[PDB]
Structure formats: C-alpha cells, structure tokens
C-alpha cells in the first residue's frame, strides 16, 4: 500500500488525515514533531514514506528541517497551511514543494491532491 506521513503540529489533524487516507487505501503515520520524524528517517533506511504532508506553521520550526532533509529525493512533499495563510503558494515554490492545501479541506480535493502526488488513480 502507498505509504503517507504527515507532520502537523496539531494531533487531531494527524488523527483526521490518517483515518481519511485509510479509508481510501493509504497506510500513514502522522507526528507532532518533525524532529520525531527525522530521528526514524536516520535510524533506519526501511522507513520511507512516497509523500510527506507537511505543516509549514509548525510554532518553532515551520518544518524546516524536514523540507532540508528530503529535498531533491524520491519523497515529494505536499504543504499543508491554515485557511488564512496568503502566501503558501510562494512557498511551495521556492520550497520545491509538489503541490499544496489549505485547512480544511474537502475530501475530493485532498484525496485527489494526495493521489496526484503518489502517482496513482483517485478513488473519487
Ligand atoms: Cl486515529
Ligand atoms: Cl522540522
Ligand atoms: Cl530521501
């Protein structure tokens, strides 16, 4: 199954989008922390997600280390934000970010972002 992780400051975004993606077939795992993140990445090469969600406000990090480590490898990133943020789209740009959303999202939307991303037909 295609593999997700979501890194949000925020659980209960974590809690929504992994029951959303398994609801379609998508095993993910989510963290509070970035830094919780990279320490599986390091520790072993079998962990690695085919995309990772990632909140771009996480208060005293804004995912920062997690975009440096994955950037110019197989693992797209897709940049997830608050209703309000007027500026994610430079962002993702500048970022290389693959796409980006903002919260909440609609199911249809999300999901075919998430697919579109994976490489892989959408369910809806
Ligand atoms: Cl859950
Ligand atoms: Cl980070
Ligand atoms: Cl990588």
Same mark, same amino acid.
């Given at each position: 199954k295609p593999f997700? !992780? /979501? !890194?949000?400051?925020d659980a209960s975004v974590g809690r929504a989008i992994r029951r959303l993606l398994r609801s379609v077939g @998508?095993?993910? $795992?989510?963290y509070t922390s970035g830094d919780?993140?990279?320490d599986v990445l390091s520790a072993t090469p079998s962990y690695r997600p085919d995309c990772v969600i990632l909140d771009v406000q996480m208060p005293g990090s804004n995912? =920062?280390? !997690?975009?440096?480590?994955?950037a110019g490898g197989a693992v797209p /990133? @897709?940049? =997830?934000?608050?209703?309000? $943020?007027?500026?994610?789209?430079e962002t993702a740009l500048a970022a290389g970010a693959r796409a980006y959303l903002?919260?909440?999202?609609?199911? !249809?939307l999300f999901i075919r972002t998430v697919c579109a991303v994976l490489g892989i037909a959408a369910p809806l």
């Open positions: 997700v !992780v /979501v !890194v949000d400051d @998508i095993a993910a $795992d989510t919780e993140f990279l995912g =920062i280390e !997690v975009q440096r480590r994955l /990133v @897709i940049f =997830i934000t608050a209703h309000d $943020d007027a500026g994610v789209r903002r919260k909440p999202f609609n199911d !249809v």
